[PDB]
Enzyme design. Structure first.
Site, mmCIF file in Angstrom:
data_model
loop_
_atom_site.group_PDB
_atom_site.id
_atom_site.type_symbol
_atom_site.label_atom_id
_atom_site.label_comp_id
_atom_site.label_asym_id
_atom_site.label_seq_id
_atom_site.Cartn_x
_atom_site.Cartn_y
_atom_site.Cartn_z
ATOM 1 N N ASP A 48 36.167 50.416 39.588
ATOM 2 C CA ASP A 48 36.173 50.751 38.151
ATOM 3 C C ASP A 48 34.759 50.578 37.589
ATOM 4 O O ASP A 48 34.150 49.519 37.899
ATOM 5 C CB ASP A 48 37.142 49.864 37.408
ATOM 6 C CG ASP A 48 38.581 49.966 37.844
ATOM 7 O OD1 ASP A 48 38.977 50.990 38.358
ATOM 8 O OD2 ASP A 48 39.299 49.016 37.610
ATOM 9 N N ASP A 104 42.673 48.687 46.768
ATOM 10 C CA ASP A 104 42.757 49.992 47.488
ATOM 11 C C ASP A 104 41.362 50.481 47.900
ATOM 12 O O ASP A 104 41.317 51.517 48.568
ATOM 13 C CB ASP A 104 43.535 51.037 46.679
ATOM 14 C CG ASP A 104 42.854 51.621 45.452
ATOM 15 O OD1 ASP A 104 41.761 51.137 45.080
ATOM 16 O OD2 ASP A 104 43.391 52.566 44.886
ATOM 17 N N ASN A 147 38.058 54.672 36.994
ATOM 18 C CA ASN A 147 38.280 54.456 38.431
ATOM 19 C C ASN A 147 37.783 55.622 39.283
ATOM 20 O O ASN A 147 38.036 56.771 38.952
ATOM 21 C CB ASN A 147 39.764 54.213 38.626
ATOM 22 C CG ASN A 147 40.123 53.718 39.988
ATOM 23 O OD1 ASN A 147 40.077 52.528 40.265
ATOM 24 N ND2 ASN A 147 40.477 54.633 40.853
ATOM 25 N N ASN A 202 38.860 47.377 43.298
ATOM 26 C CA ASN A 202 40.345 47.333 43.419
ATOM 27 C C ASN A 202 40.740 47.116 44.884
ATOM 28 O O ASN A 202 39.947 47.410 45.789
ATOM 29 C CB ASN A 202 40.934 48.597 42.818
ATOM 30 C CG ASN A 202 40.453 48.860 41.409
ATOM 31 O OD1 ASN A 202 40.532 47.969 40.586
ATOM 32 N ND2 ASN A 202 39.967 50.048 41.132
#
Ligand SMILES: [Cl-]
Ligand SMILES: [Cl-]
Ligand SMILES: [Cl-]
Ligand SMILES: [Cl-]
Ligand SMILES: [Cl-]
Ligand SMILES: [Cl-]
Ligand SMILES: [Cl-]
Ligand code: NA
Length: 129
Positions: free
Chosen positions: A52, A48, A59, A46
């Protein structure tokens, strides 16, 4: 491991996901299809920096420890690598905590966008269960 559709339906049923928090087995199969294409080894990074993991793309920001997600939690108390096993137990047990968290299966954005409100029973049609 890449599961077959009916093979994964059976495994999820054996691990108590059918009608867990009111979500019929087809919901869980549909979510797995669009999160991972039924591949336990699926991973996705992701923006950020979280990752996952596994058949339900759980996550690292909240649910598992991968040692590279700063300020994250590990609410399922597992290494994220456990979510990539051929044995779905860790993924199922962690998914039960996630779906109990308050937003039900809306936690899984692919379920909300691709499964919610559709004929999910089609995902278990034909299967010996
Ligand atoms: Cl399929
Ligand atoms: Cl169903
Ligand atoms: Cl971390
Ligand atoms: Cl924690
Ligand atoms: Cl760990
Ligand atoms: Cl399994
Ligand atoms: Cl709900
Ligand atoms: Na974490």
């Amino acid at each position: 491991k890449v599961f077959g559709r009916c093979e994964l339906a059976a495994a999820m049923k054996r691990h108590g996901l059918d009608n867990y928090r009111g979500y019929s087995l087809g919901n869980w199969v549909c979510a797995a299809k669009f999160e991972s294409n039924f591949n336990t080894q699926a991973t996705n990074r992701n923006t950020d920096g979280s990752t996952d993991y596994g058949i339900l793309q759980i996550n690292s920001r909240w649910w598992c420890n991968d040692g590279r997600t700063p300020g994250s939690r590990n609410l399922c108390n597992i290494p994220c690598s456990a979510l990539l096993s051929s044995d779905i137990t860790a993924s199922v047990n962690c998914a039960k905590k996630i779906v109990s968290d308050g937003n039900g299966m809306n936690a899984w954005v692919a379920w909300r966008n691709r499964c919610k409100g559709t004929d999910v029973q089609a995902w278990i049609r034909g299967c010996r269960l």
